[PDB]
Amino acid sequence: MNIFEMLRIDEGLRLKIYKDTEGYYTIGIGHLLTKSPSLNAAKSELDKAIGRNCNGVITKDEAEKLFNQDVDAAVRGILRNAKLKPVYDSLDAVRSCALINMVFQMGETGVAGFTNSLRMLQQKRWDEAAVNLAKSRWYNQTPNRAKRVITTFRTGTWDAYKNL
């Protein structure tokens, strides 16, 4: 398993503009277009992103292109962030993907705000971080995904994604 497969599983793939779990216009593999309640604004954002007149629909190759850009951005964001980088640097390859996953879903500021959890991951107190991570709006709003990610941080294995 790798970060792309993991996220492809958590985000799914849609070629037409849709509303994510929070009600925001999104497309492709979890690519947020805008937070504005305007479909019109969303379509304009889509066009700008792809570079052509899409009329709200895209091809799979285009979805995958946005996806590569989005993973790249998440990783680079983590590395530029003073709170996130040290954690990411301390984690093994498998657990690092869980951190990337959270950043992809909530953004760098969202994640950097999980200070207590971050401190526990850094200290390698897996079980404790797991409990702390679960005491969040994130867990209560998207429990199945949060469970998969948290299990990944706890065990350092892909078991939660395995056989899905």
Active-site positions?
Answer: 11, 20
> Residue 104 annotated as binding?
yes
Contact code string over 94-133 relative to K ion, x by CB under 5 A? --x-------------------------------------
Sites for Cl ion among residues 80-139 (CB under 5 A): 137
Shortest Å, Cβ 85 to K ion:
10
Query: String of b and e for 9-39 (b: at least 16 CB within 10 Å)?
Result: ebbeebeebeebeeeebbbbbbbbbbeeeee
Q: Does residue 140 touch Cl ion according to CB under 5 A?
A: yes
Q: Which is nearer to Cl ion, 53 or 163 (CB)?
A: 163
Q: Which member of 6, 91, 133, 149 binds K ion (CB under 5 A)?
A: 91
DSSP H helical segments within the chain, as ranges?
Answer: 3-11, 39-50, 60-80, 85-90, 93-106, 108-112, 115-122, 126-134, 137-141, 143-155
Q: Of Cl ion, K ion, none, which one does residue 91 interact with (CB within 5 to 8 Å by kind)? A: K ion
Q: Residue 8 has which token pair? A: 């492809």
Annotated binding site for substrate: 32, 104, 117, 132
